[PDB]
Design a binder for this molecule. Structure first.
Ligand SMILES: *[C@@H]1O[C@H](CO)[C@@H](O)[C@H](O)[C@H]1NC(C)=O
Ligand SMILES: *[C@@H]1O[C@H](CO)[C@@H](O)[C@H](O)[C@H]1NC(C)=O
Lengths: 172, 53
């Protein structure tokens, strides 16, 4: 990727997560838990959709016959036509293969950005209550029950109501 | 060369009369005269194929 979180520090994907594209997986006292993040996943899907809506259902122009498959046209004009057509085919073949590489390069980096945007946003919610190991994880330094986890997800985490507790364990 | 039993050939020529203009044929032989003229009804598309409709 370009933002290094699709191959950089998230080592691998989660084949079990079919809820969405990006999501949370926590661990705490009550146990394990996995959920997907809608606001991010839909932000990339709405973007791929833009590309598809741009390449598909184009209303191409109307063209007519200048050749004849049954009664071949005159030679000198038949070559100017064969030649011209062969040239345009070069352009479109080039335009087609280049456009996909441009788009496929963009989509692959575009998804990174959505991962890094999620990651670097959750980190700000946990201002000084947690530290990031660097594997795509957040080591939380207070009791975070399954309600506290869901607090993070829908962005209700009040960093203040855990800070003094968290800062204590942070330095000892 | 023989085609449909005839070694003669007819050469078909054509022009397009504009409205209110006049076409005139002088001929003392070897003429295949038109009986009816032809007008275009609209727009369409022609193709060449050998498959079912
Ligand atoms: C032009 O190309 C067609 C096939 O696309 C071929 O059949 C035809 O012989 C060509 N004409 C000339 C003059 O090369
Ligand atoms: C052709 O002539 C007729 C009358 O003879 C006239 O009504 C008509 O406008 C003319 N059309 C053109 C294109 O000159």
């Amino acid at each position: 990727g370009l933002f290094g979180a699709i191959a950089g520090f998230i080592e691998n994907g989660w084949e079990g997560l079919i809820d969405g594209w990006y999501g949370f997986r926590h661990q705490n006292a009550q146990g394990e838990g996995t959920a997907a993040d809608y606001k991010s996943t839909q932000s990339a899907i709405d973007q791929i959709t833009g590309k598809l809506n741009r390449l598909i259902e184009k209303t191409n122009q109307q063209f007519e016959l200048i050749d004849n498959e049954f009664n071949e046209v005159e030679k000198q004009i038949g070559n100017v036509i064969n030649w011209t057509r062969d040239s345009i085919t070069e352009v479109w073949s080039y335009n087609a293969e280049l456009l996909v590489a441009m788009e496929n390069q963009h989509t692959i980096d575009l998804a990174d950005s959505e991962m890094d945007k999620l990651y670097e946003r959750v980190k700000r919610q946990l201002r000084e209550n947690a530290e990031e190991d660097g594997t795509g994880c957040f080591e939380i330094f207070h009791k975070c029950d399954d309600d506290c986890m869901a607090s993070i997800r829908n962005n209700t985490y009040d960093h203040s109501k855990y800070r003094e507790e968290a800062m204590q364990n942070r330095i000892q | 060369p023989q085609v449909n039993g005839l070694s003669g050939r007819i050469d078909f020529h054509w022009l397009m009369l504009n409205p209110n203009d006049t076409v005139t044929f002088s001929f003392n032989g070897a003429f295949i005269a038109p009986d009816r003229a032809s007008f275009l009804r609209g727009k369409s598309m022609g193709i060449q194929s050998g498959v079912q409709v």
